[PDB]
Structure formats: C-alpha cells, structure tokens
C-alpha cells in the first residue's frame with residue numbers, strides 16, 4: 038500500500054510548526070524557471086493525480102503507520118497526527134486541495150505558471166506544500182516529452198530539407214531505454230512521455246500506463262518491429278554470423294527486421310555478408326518489409342557514414358528530387374548507440390553534408406532519451422507565492438541576493454494569451470482585472486476528485502510541431 | 508498488477524525465433540565493464556528477485572493480456588504463447604532460471620562477473636535473456652551505492668585530516684533527492700542505495716523498501732531532523748525574516764534544526780539576524796541541539812567560505828588539536844545546493860585550504876545523489892557468454908572491431924580470490940580446473956525461489972570503507 042503520509046521529504050513533516058500563526062491559506066505554483074529549451078511540453082500531472090492523490094488517501098492505519106515511522110526516524114514525536122485525523126474525519130480521507138493546470142500537451146515558454154496548488158480548508162494550510170515532493174516529480178515526464186519533442190524538431194528539419202516532406206517522421210526516434218532507466222515505474226512514465234511525440238517504442242511499460250491513465254482511440258499508442266540482439270547473433274558462434282543473419286531475415290521475411298551487425302566487424306558484415314553473400318535475400322524483400330542494418334559501436338557519425346558508403350556501393354542507389362542519395366526501399370539503417378539530442382544533430386548534419394537523405398536512417402535512443410535528464414535541465418520548481426494570515430493576503434517570494442535566477446513569482450497567478458498570441462503569466466492577482474482574457478489554467482483536482490481529464494490523443498494534438506501544423 | 512510478460516524490451520518478444528535451432532541453454536552474465544570508479548558496490552538484486560521474479564509470476568490471464576497487447580504492438584502474432592504456457596503448466600508459473608551472484612554490499616573491481624543467469628529447463632532457453640531488461644535495472648542501485656560510497660571516501664579523508672577522527676561521518680551526506688528523481692519507485696530504490704553508506708535521509712520511501720526486502724536490527728535504517736524550507740520563511744513576509752527564524756528555533760529549541768537562510772540575503776541573515784538580533788537564542792542551545800544554518804544559492808565553495816568567515820566573527824571559534832577552526836558546538840552549517848561528487852571535493856578542499864574543519868559542515872545532495880547517474884557511468888551490462896546447441900557447449904561473445912571496450916567475456920564464468928587476495932574472473936569454464944579455489948558467487952535464485960539473501964546490516968558491513976575497518 039502506497040501511503041501519502043510517507044511520500045514527502047522528511048522535513049515537511051515538521052513544517053506545520055513553522056508557518057506564521059493564523060495562516061488559513063498557502064498557495065503555491067510550479068514553473069520551468071527561466072535561465073536551448075525555450076518551450077516545454079506540459080505532461081504527466083494526470084498520472085500523479087489519479088495514481089497517488091485522488092480518493093480516500095488517508096486511513097486510520099496509514100496515520101498510525103506514519104506516526105510509528107516518524108517517531109523512530111526523528112527520534113522525536115513531531116508529526117501532525119491531529120491535522121491528518123481532521124482530513125480523515127471531515128473529508129473521508131480526501132485531500133482538501135485544489136489544483137489548476139494548463140492542459141496536458143500544451144507547449145509553453147519557460148518562466149510561466151504551469152499549475153497551482155492551494156488548500157480549500159483553512160485547517161489544511163500545511164497540506165499545500167506537503168505534496169510538493171510528489172507533484173514536483175512531474176519534472177520527469179515534462180522533461181522527457183520536451184527533450185523528445187526537441188529531437189523531433191531536428192529530425193523534421195533535416196528530413197524536410199533532404200527529402201521534401203515529413204513522411205514517417207513519427208517513427209524516426211525509437212525508445213530503447215527500458216534497461217537504462219532507474220525503475221519499472223520510471224520506464225512506464227518516461228516511455229509514455231516519449232510517445233507524446235513519436236509512435237515507436239520498445240519500452241512496453243509505457244503502453245499500459247497510457248491505457249490506464251490517458252487512453253487512446255487506437256488499440257495501442259506505440260509500435261515496434263522484430264529485431265536481433267547480440268545474443269541471437271553470437272549464439273551461432275563466431276564463424277557462423279552469416280548463418281545467423283540468414284536465419285533471422287528468413288524467419289522475418291515479410292515484416293521489417295532490424296539486425297545488429299557489429300558483433301565482430303560491422304564493415305565486413307555490410308560489405309561482404311549483406312553486400313555479397315546474402316544480397317539475394319535482401320533485394321527480394323518488400324518495400325513494407327525492409328532489412329534494417331544496425332551498427333552499434335564506434336563513433337556514431339563516422340560509423341553511419343561508412344556504413345552508408347559501403348551499402349551505396351553494393352546496392353542500387355538513387356538520387357531523389359532534392360539531390361540526396363537514397364538506398365533502395367528494401368534496405369535501411371538504424372543507429373541506436375550513443376544517440377542523444379546532441380549526437381542526433383551531429384549525425385543528421387553529417388549525413389546532409391555527405392548528400393545522404395535522412396530517409397535512409399532511423400534512430401534508437403535509450404539512456405539519452407529516458408535517463409540522462411535532471412530536474413535542473415528545465416529548472417522545474419514549486420514555490421509558495423501567496424498566503425493568507427489573519428485574514429489578510431500577502432504576496433510572498435524568494436529572491437536570493439547571489440542568484441537572481443532563483444527569484445520566484447509573487448501573489449496569485451494566472452496564465453493568459455497575449456494580444457500577439459503568445460503566453461504571459463500575470464502576478465499579484467492581476468488576472469482579476471480581466472485585461473487579458475481567460476485564464477488558461479483549469480481546475481483538474483479538487484477535494485479528492487479529478488475534475489478535468491485529457492486523452493492521450495488530445496495531448497498528442499496539443500504537442501504537435503509547427504511544421505506538422507504545416 | 509505487474510506482468511513479467513510485459514516487462515521486457517519489445518524485440519525480446521521475437522528472440523525465441525532467432526537462436527540456433529536445438530538450443531537447450533543460454534547462459535549470460537552481468538558486469539560493470541572496464542573502461543574513475545575503479546570498484547563498485549553490488550547492491551539491489553535482492554529487491555528485484557523478490558518484487559518481480561519469485562513465485563508464481565505467470566498466469567493464464569497474464570499470458571492472454573500479453574498476447575493481446577503484442578498483437579497490436581507488432582501488428583502481428585509473434586508472441587511465444589506456447590513457451591509461456593509451458594512454464595505455467597510445468598512449473599506452476601515459477602521461472603526455471605538459476606541466478607548466481609556476489610554477496611550484496613560486496614565491493615568489487617570493474618570488469619568482474621557480478622551475477623550469472625541460465626535456464627534450468629531446455630525448453631526455456633529463451634527465458635534467460637527475456638529477463639535481461641529487468642535485471643539490468645540493477646545498474647541503478649549499484650551506481651547510487653557506488654557513487655555515494657565514493658563521496659564517503661572524500662568526506663572521510665578530509666574529516667580525518669582536519670579533525671583527527673571520523674566521528675559523525677555517517678551523517679555528513681544527506682539525501683535531499685526525493686523530488687528530483689523520476690518516480691516514487693526510483694526514490695525508494697535510490698534512497699536505499701545511499702543508506703548503504705550513510706544514515707541520513709529525507710527520502711522517506713527508502714525506509715519501507717529496506718524494511719520489506721532487506722531488514723535491519725534497528726527500527727529504521729535512516730534518520731532526519733527538523734528543517735525549514737523557503738515557504739516557511741517567506742510566508743512571514745519579506746520584512747519578517749527575523750520573526751520566522753525566531754519562531755522556528757523556539758519551536759525546535761531542544762533538537763537540531765536546519766534553517767534555510769538565503770531567501771533574500773544569506774550574508775545579512777548570517778551576520779545581522781543570526782549573528783546579532785537572535786544571537787542570544789543560538790548561544791543558549793545544547794550541543795545535542797545545534798542550529799544548522801543552510802545557505803542554498805551562489806557559488807557553493809565561495810558561499811560556504813563567506814558564511815563560515817561571517818560566523819567566525821560573530822561567534823566564539825576554537826582551534827582543534829589539528830590546527831583547524833571550529834564553530835561552537837551549538838552552531839553548524841549545511842550546504843545542500845549544487846552538491847555532487849565533484850563539487851563536494853571542491854568544497855572540502857577549499858575549506859581545508861582556509862583552515863576550516865570539516866566538522867563544521869554537512870552536505871545535502873538531491874539530483875546529484877539520486878538522478879544525475881546513468882548506466883554508462885560504470886558500464887553495467889548483461890551479455891550471453893555460453894550456449895548449448897545440439898548438445899555441444901560453445902563459448903560466445905561480442906568483440907566489435909571499432910570498440911575493444913565493448914568486448915564481452917567468453918564461456919562459463921566464475922569469481923575467485925587471487926593468491927594476493929584480490930578478485931579475478933575466470934572464463935571458459937576454467938574455474939573447474941580448481942587452480943583458483945572455490946567460486947565466490949552464490950546461488951541466489953533457483954526455479955522461482957530466492958535461495959540466499961542478505962540483511963541490510965550485513966550489506967552495510969560488506970560496504971565499509973577500509974579506513975573505517977582500519
């Protein structure tokens with residue numbers, strides 16, 4: 038059993054004794070604080086609301102367990118038993134909290150309010166920041182979705198330049214990250230975030246998360262194809278790599294198949310094994326079932342270029358209408374080693390310079406896609422901006438002398454469209470003046486109930502690229 | 508409800524069709540591959556074995572669900588229903604797998620076998636690498652434990668040099684990482700890995716994980732103390748920072764209390780508020796209840812040094828027997844911003860150069876400790892080294908021409924003590940020659956049962972620093 042009373046930073050257990058006396062309201066907000074990643078995809082809050090925050094989340098037993106744990110953990114009795122019992126007795130253990138959020142999938146520039154949190158009962162002023170820790174973990178799906186989207190921009194730019202269109206863009210960056218993340222839960226969350234932008238994944242955990250918490254009209258939100266790993270090649274023995282390749286492409290003769298080719302010598306594999314010995318098994322394949330050759334080692338750019346050079350001399354290459362070289366439709370390449378947002382850019386630019394179409398290549402990314410990301414990439418942060426004490430509201434904030442970048446916003450916040458159609462966050466309750474049209478934040482959680490939800494289809498629509506919007 | 512049939516990389520669903528015909532055995536191993544991190548702490552496999560791998564992990568319902576999901580995911584019927592049904596019918600859904608591993612908490616040089624996996628039924632040759640994905644996630648607790656231990660070495664060195672002993676070392680690096688990790692599950696796993704080396708944590712999730720899967724003689728494996736956050740200071744209003752400080756130290760007058768002091772001006776807070784206005788409330792405190800001043804912004808080293816210099820002029824400083832400056836026992840500092848293994852080193856060395864004892868300071872680390880780590884840091888990797896096909900065992904491996912660092916080991920593996928008492932991994936079944944004594948790996952999992960396990964107390968003992976043992 039998950040216990041929300043045990044799902045906070047230890048020090049937050051002690052904060053109910055630290056706020057000003059006679060405080061009836063604590064109001065806090067989340068932003069991806071300003072100073073590359075100029076705009077962020079808001080995604081993942083709905084998962085947290087449903088899995089952890091909604092319904093009866095307080096019980097007699099959970100309160101007693103927290104009491105027992107904290108007694109030993111602090112070697113002291115500090116723990117707001119009275120405060121938690123109040124929620125249990127008054128609200129049947131539902132959290133007296135209201136959360137307002139920008140719609141999921143929305144693409145918002147840095148430094149804007151993305152969601153706000155406040156208590157709905159004066160007794161529970163302490164609860165707003167109790168749940169900071171769990172809500173701030175939304176940094177992860179936001180960051181995966183954003184970084185995945187930025188890679189989609191790079192791919193779109195180069196695919197368009199080298200081919201004249203964006204056909205198949207949504208399968209150009211595949212999630213290989215299941216083994217390389219920190220947990221099963223992280224795998225599902227991160228994979229789901231990547232699927233906001235693409236349709237290809239091997240991180241199966243993402244599928245069930247989307248089905249349970251978001252939903253799609255299609256049976257599944259992500260797809261894959263058969264592929265070898267080094268074990269299915271090397272098991273045949275060093276002298277039998279050709280036998281492995283032949284067996285595998287024949288087993289998967291009528292679907293696309295990726296075959297890792299660098300077990301011993303990627304260049305030999307391309308030029309002699311695929312390019313000569315087994316060439317007859319390749320050139321006979323359907324356009325709907327290409328062989329996808331997979332290098333997996335060496336300098337990513339150098340290796341991709343050398344593989345393409347080798348294949349271009351063993352297979353019939355055409356020149357497309359943009360002037361770029363194109364392998365025959367039954368043959369493609371996938372680079373799935375060392376791919377991150379930086380190396381992706383390097384590879385596609387290198388290909389373009391050597392006159393190879395991005396049509397020729399797909400990418401897989403594991404650690405770079407799902408694990409090599411932190412909360413400080415987008416400066417995802419939760420801060421109190423407004424309190425009511427003795428019936429008077431005051432606008433509060435931090436502003437550390439040595440770091441203006443950590444200054445936080447003041448007062449009650451709202452998010453608005455500007456006259457030019459951009460975004461602006463209004464501070465100090467100025468949204469109440471109604472000079473800027475409707476607040477784009479919507480109540481998504483109130484008093485233990487999820488009040489507004491988005492489908493995965495809606496999220497995908499909101500997160501589209503401008504070029505996709507033609 | 509976790510389903511092991513949906514907890515693998517998609518392509519592994521297709522591998523049972525790719526191995527050589529009549530393969531009865533696939534044998535694989537995990538290492539932290541050689542190229543500072545020269546030695547790794549082996550920790551976390553026991554969690555995976557118990558939570559995910561043991562007992563009846565296959566049911567009719569789980570098979571049908573996987574079948575239904577993969578049909579859509581692959582747009583084809585590639586799923587091995589028969590193979591999974593065999594496990595259900597023959598072994599009541601228990602995995603016919605044997606896993607041997609080095610004891611948890613063991614500190615082992617890079618490039619050694621840490622665990623091995625093989626099928627115990629010839630029909631389940633495909634099962635060995637099915638579970639690669641889930642087992643490889645052990646990289647995370649291994650890496651957190653290892654990186655946390657490397658930071659303990661730094662702290663030990665400087666604490667010993669500046670004070671003459673290691674008293675309180677186990678509380679010098681505190682886990683602040685709960686909000687900065689990618690999920691609740693990751694938080695618990697990561698926190699538990701840090702607790703292999705230290706006793707201080709705010710990531711409460713780590714406590715219940717340890718209790719459930721490992722166990723300690725003590726009631727809890729980790730501890731904390733009351734502390735403020737920016738919201739409990741700023742809520743008082745910008746003109747009332749002093750009132751906030753006074754309220755908090757008075758509420759927590761007889762236990763240690765950390766109070767964040769950089770909301771507006773860290774240097775003013777130290778020199779004028781703590782150092783003058785509230786000095787009388789500080790010098791009266793017990794040595795068991797110090798005020799711990801917490802800066803949280805600016806250059807970490809520069810800020811710590813300036814804070815110490817300020818405090819040194821407002822409070823009575825002594826010189827310890829090693830010649831280093833020491834704040835009075837009722838006053839300490841905690842630096843919890845921007846701390847990672849690199850900045851930790853820079854701060855303690857800078858303090859040493861300015862003649863400040865490491866006794867004066869403790870560290871908190873969040874993102875650096877639990878999130879800013881990837882599988883490539885220690886090159887944690889799972890590879891097939893031995894197969895049996897047509898009754899003949901063959902030693903198998905990869906050895907990519909362009910990257911000798913990715914070469915894998917050959918044949919049946921074992922771990923041994925050398926004549927000088929170091930570790931060596933024997934390949935090609937050479938352990939059977941008995942020239943190197945007994946295999947140090949133990950069977951930890953066999954046919955659905957955990958066969959050997961370790962308490963958290965034993966893991967801690969195994970992971971001790973030499974300087975602690977000495």
Ligand SMILES: CC(C)(C)OC(=O)N1CCC2(CC1)C[C@@H]2CNC(=O)N1Cc2ccncc2C1
Nearest residue numbers: 208211213239262264293295329371399516518
């Ligand atoms: C056919 C079409 C053009 C629509 O799509 C593609 O051509 N793609 C290129 C090939 C593709 C699908 C997209 C990526 C997957 C093949 N999988 C693969 O190579 N894997 C899986 C995996 C998981 C973890 N680690 C290592 C690997 C190696």
Ligand SMILES: CC(C)(C)OC(=O)N1CCC2(CC1)C[C@@H]2CNC(=O)N1Cc2ccncc2C1
Nearest residue numbers: 046048678681683709732734763765799841869
């Ligand atoms: C008294 C003794 C000498 C034994 O130990 C210390 O002096 N310590 C320094 C103070 C200590 C305990 C060890 C760390 C905790 C105070 N907690 C704290 O500042 N937090 C918690 C937190 C969690 C997430 N993010 C930000 C923070 C800010």
